[PDB]
Amino acid sequence: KFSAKRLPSTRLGTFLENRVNDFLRRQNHPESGEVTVRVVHASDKTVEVKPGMKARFVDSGEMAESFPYRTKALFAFEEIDGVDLCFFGMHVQEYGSDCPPPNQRRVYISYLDSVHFFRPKCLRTAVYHEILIGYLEYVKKLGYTTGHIWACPPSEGDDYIFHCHPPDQKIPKPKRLQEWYKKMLDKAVSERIVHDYKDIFKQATEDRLTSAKELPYFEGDFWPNVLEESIKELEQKTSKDLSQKLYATMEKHKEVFFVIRLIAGPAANSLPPIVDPDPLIPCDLMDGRDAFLTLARDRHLEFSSLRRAQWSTGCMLVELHTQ
Ligand SMILES: CNC(=O)Nc1ccc2c(c1)CC[C@@]21OC(=O)N(CC(=O)N(Cc2ccc(F)cc2)[C@@H](C)C(F)(F)F)C1=O
Numbered sequence: 001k002f003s004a005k006r007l008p009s010t011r012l013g014t015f016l017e018n019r020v021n022d023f024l025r026r027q028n029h030p031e032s033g034e035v036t037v038r039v040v041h042a043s044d045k046t047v048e049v050k051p052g053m054k055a056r057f058v059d060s061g062e063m064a065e066s067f068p069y070r071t072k073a074l075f076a077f078e079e080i081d082g083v084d085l086c087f088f089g090m091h092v093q094e095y096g097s098d099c100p101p102p103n104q105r106r107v108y109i110s111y112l113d114s115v116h117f118f119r120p121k122c123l124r125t126a127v128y129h130e131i132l133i134g135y136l137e138y139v140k141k142l143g144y145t146t147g148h149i150w151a152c153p154p155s156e157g158d159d160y161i162f163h164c165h166p167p168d169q170k171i172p173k174p175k176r177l178q179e180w181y182k183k184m185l186d187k188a189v190s191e192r193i194v195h196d197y198k199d200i201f202k203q204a205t206e207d208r209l210t211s212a213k214e215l216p217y218f219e220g221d222f223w224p225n226v227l228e229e230s231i232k233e234l235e236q237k238t239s240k241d242l243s244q245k246l247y248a249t250m251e252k253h254k255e256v257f258f259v260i261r262l263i264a265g266p267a268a269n270s271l272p273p274i275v276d277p278d279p280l281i282p283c284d285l286m287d288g289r290d291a292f293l294t295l296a297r298d299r300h301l302e303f304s305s306l307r308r309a310q311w312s313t314g315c316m317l318v319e320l321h322t323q
């Protein structure tokens with residue numbers, strides 16, 4: 001039996017599917033099927049401060065050399081005609097209470113992906129909200145104060161977590177994707193899960209950010225590459241700053257980057273240490289998005305039709321059950 005439900009359990013994965021299924025139960029639509037949510041990878045990693053920032057702040061003892069975090073991979077599956085169809089997947093970076101500033105108590109979405117075959121089509125949007133709001137609610141409960149989202153769609157014919165998408169599933173334009181996350185976060189605010197949210201520029205302004213060493217530094221994020229480019233440009237200068245370039249860049253791309261406050265004011269100051277109840281889950285196939293993208297490209301595990309998607313889901317589960 002190589003079904004999604006059979007995969008090992010986590011406090012995180014069960015919190016999410018319960019939120020999804022309670023929602024669907026209430027909706028009581030006859031075309032909906034049971035959804036199952038599973039964390040298929042959990043490992044401890046570090047994000048190393050890149051050369052420019054290392055020479056400016058690390059070498060002077062002003063900034064930590066690296067930031068420890070936990071990476072988790074999790075996927076969601078719905079029963080569509082007696083069989084599991086993987087319609088959502090996500091990779092996250094979690095920086096706990098032992099992490100040095102500016103990263104402590106922060107979560108970041110590395111990549112998120114979906115296959116538009118959730119049944120019915122009229123309930124897709126609402127189900128995506130349940131998973132994402134549920135993840136925010138879950139980490140807030142553990143004592144993570146902030147969520148970070150880089151709302152950016154893929155490049156020219158680019159695939160994130162799933163191999164070969166339906167040609168019908170259009171790559172959203174940036175303003176559509178931004179509006180989507182704004183709407184999900186307004187809903188999380190109304191449910192009293194998110195205290196408030198802000199764009200990166202407005203957030204640094206309100207935090208009185210004066211140095212590049214104060215900006216959260218995540219694996220594969222836009223801002224560590226911007227700082228590198230900016231330092232290179234500034235070091236090339238001869239005469240016969242960094243923060244002002246950072247503020248200008250942040251203003252220019254502000255709508256793309258969300259800073260989500262889950263815990264506000266004094267409640268965020270007297271928190272106990274973050275204790276994750278879930279154990280580490282070694283699974284090389286799901287350590288980052290590349291290993292599953294390769295296995296799916298080699299074994300032709302496609303998601304370009306409902307039938308092709310259901311097929312590749314089955315294969316995915318057989319591979320996940322082997323380890
Ligand atoms: C040949 N065809 C292709 O390659 N198709 C194709 C289309 C889209 C995308 C990819 C490939 C790769 C990744 C992805 O790119 C992207 O931006 N998203 C999010 C996205 O589309 N949504 C936001 C969303 C969805 C589900 C959630 F749980 C949370 C948030 C929708 C609903 C929106 F945009 F409408 F809000 C993707 O899943």
Ligand code: NA
Nearest residue numbers: 110111112152
């Ligand atoms: Na993404």
